[PDB]
Every structure is written in C-alpha cells, then in structure tokens.
C-alpha cells in the first residue's frame, strides 16, 4: 500500500472519479502538494494514510511520516518533469529551469503547462532523485504557466 | 469524499529525452497562504 513510486490522487463520491493530483511514495511516506488534499487523510487500497507534516506556505504535505525528499536542484542542470496528467500515462519532459527570484532567494522554476490534476508530479535530477514537486506557480502575461520546483526540508 | 491513491509508475529518468520549454527569469513574491505572484 506504500510501495515506492508515483501515484495519482483521486476523488470520488457516488459517481465517477476525478484526478486532483499526484504524489511520491518514498521510504514509506507519501509526498504531495497541500492544495491537492487540503491536508485530509488518504485511502490506499484498504489502508488509511494520515497526514504527518505539512506547511501551507510551502504548499506541501507528507503522510505516514516526515518529509523524506531531500535532493536539491543543482542550479545548473536540466531536469525532468515526470508528468502524470489526468487520463494519461506518466511521461518524462526534459527542460532547463528558469528562476523565481524572491526576496528570500532564488527557486528553480519550470515553464511547463499541464492540467490542474497534474499537481504533485515529481521533478527529477539525472540520477532520478526527486528534487521537488510540480504545481505551485504563476501565470505570465500570455496565459502560460511557470511552476516552482517546490522541495521540502528533510529534518 | 473518498480521496484515494493509485499507483501510476516508477520514478526513473528517461535517457535521450529532448529538452523543451524556456527558462524564464521572473521576480515573484510568496504569501503566507502559499500563493506566488508576479512583482511588477
């Protein structure tokens, strides 16, 4: 129920299902963006995954234990978005990040645009390590999208 | 609401992928609710 890999986050009531996001299972912990789940509990097969840590400002949440993803973008190299869009199989998109320049420092950012339910898809370095999650970003003047490479701290 | 997860694949870098997208340099702010906005 907590096997390593990338997962879709789905919701259903009485009728069909909707993909609201994506996340990463690593070291027994599920990692996604806060806006995907609003910090609510998740079902995994027959089991229940309870939120353990989260931070609205970073837009992140972890389930079953503390945040485990600690790889960082090296500030130089191309990365891959492992996009898991609603209704489509996982696909890798390589890109050279741009930069969000903030008062508190620079954050890598990817100019790749996918449906809202792609939120939480992992961004990878060349070793396959997850350097952050896709889906907290901004809309630029022409309507296109830029996502931060959002990474949490491994305490 | 039944919010649930389903496996979608292994996490692997794909060799010989073609680079795409640009590399924008943007001035942004982040508020306490986790929203980014452009500084203009």
């Amino acid at each position: 129920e907590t096997t390593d890999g990338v997962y879709r986050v789905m919701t259903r009531r009485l009728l069909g299902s909707t993909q609201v996001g994506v996340g990463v299972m690593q070291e027994g912990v599920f990692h996604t963006m806060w806006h995907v789940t609003k910090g609510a509990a998740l079902r995994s097969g027959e089991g229940r995954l309870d939120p353990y840590w989260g931070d609205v400002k970073q837009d992140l949440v972890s389930y079953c234990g503390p945040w485990k993803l600690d790889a960082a973008w090296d500030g130089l190299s191309e990365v891959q978005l492992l996009a898991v869009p609603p209704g489509e199989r996982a696909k890798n998109i390589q890109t050279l990040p741009g930069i969000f320049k903030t008062k508190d420092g620079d954050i890598g950012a990817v100019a790749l645009d996918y449906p809202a339910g792609t939120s939480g898809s992992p961004i990878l370095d060349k070793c396959g390590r997850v350097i952050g999650l896709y889906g907290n970003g901004v809309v630029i003047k022409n309507g296109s999208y830029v996502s931060a490479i959002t990474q949490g701290k491994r305490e | 609401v039944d919010m649930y997860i389903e496996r979608a694949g292994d996490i692997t870098w794909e060799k010989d992928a073609e680079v795409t997208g640009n590399s924008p340099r943007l001035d942004v702010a982040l508020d306490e609710s986790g929203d980014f906005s452009l500084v203009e």
Partner: peptide, 4 residues
Amino acid sequence: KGXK
C-alpha cells in the same frame, strides 16, 4: 495552470 488548467496557479495550482
């Protein structure tokens, strides 16, 4: 974005 289909910001989120």
